[PDB]
């Protein structure tokens, strides 16, 4: 590793933000991420039990300490999906509207 941040440590509402942001985009990033993470083909096919199969990958990856932002970013970079990295970094920030 070379940074600090567990994706599993984020609140349920922030995981929903990822699970929604890719939902109205090109063919869900879970397919490209599963291949890079070394996820078995039968596990990918078991996660299609729900109409949002991306949520099933993100949730079942979050069950283990391998769910670091540092490992997630490395995999997104290998599949040329830095577009999603920027969109998430623009939500993982502070605000003061009131």
């Amino acid at each position: 590793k070379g940074d600090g941040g567990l994706y599993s440590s984020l609140p349920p509402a922030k995981r929903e933000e990822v699970e929604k942001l890719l939902n109205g985009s090109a063919g869900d990033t879970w397919r490209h991420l599963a291949g890079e993470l070394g996820y078995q083909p039968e596990h990918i096919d078991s996660f299609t039990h729900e109409a949002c199969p991306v949520r099933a990958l993100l949730a079942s990856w979050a069950t283990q300490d391998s769910a670091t932002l540092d490992a997630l970013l490395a995999a997104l970079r290998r599949i040329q999906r830095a577009d999603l990295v920027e969109s998430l970094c623009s939500e993982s920030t502070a605000t003061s509207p009131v």
Binding site: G24, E50, A51, S87
Partner: protein
């Protein structure tokens, strides 16, 4: 407010309610067919000939009931995790950029006596 960037415009990122089902059918009018067909490409759960039966099953009330329950057809697939994000890809195919924000009620002055 949880919101995403789409076409350079902010839009609230949540499941569509009964308000959205009614405002949709009332605001698309003729575009009800087009959004339905565009949502087939964006959401494979709706790519079946649903529109063909929906048009006939809801022909009794017209464009209103036709489009009112078309919006429920997406919420039926998940509704907890389904959000306007998938619906906006259908409006993006028909350049309905202003409609995608008007749908959630963003037509208002966000607190400006109306």
């Amino acid at each position: 407010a949880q919101t995403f960037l789409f076409q350079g415009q902010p839009v609230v990122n949540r499941p569509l309610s009964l308000k959205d089902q009614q405002t949709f059918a009332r605001s698309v009018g003729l575009k009800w067919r087009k959004v339905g067909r565009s949502l087939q490409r964006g959401c494979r759960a709706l790519r079946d000939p649903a529109l063909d039966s929906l048009a006939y099953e809801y022909e009794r009330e017209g464009l209103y009931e036709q489009a009112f329950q078309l919006l429920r057809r997406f919420v039926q697939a998940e509704g907890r995790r389904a959000t306007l994000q998938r619906l906006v890809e259908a409006l993006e195919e028909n350049e309905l950029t202003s409609l995608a924000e008007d749908l959630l009620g963003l037509t208002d002055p966000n607190g400006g006596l109306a």
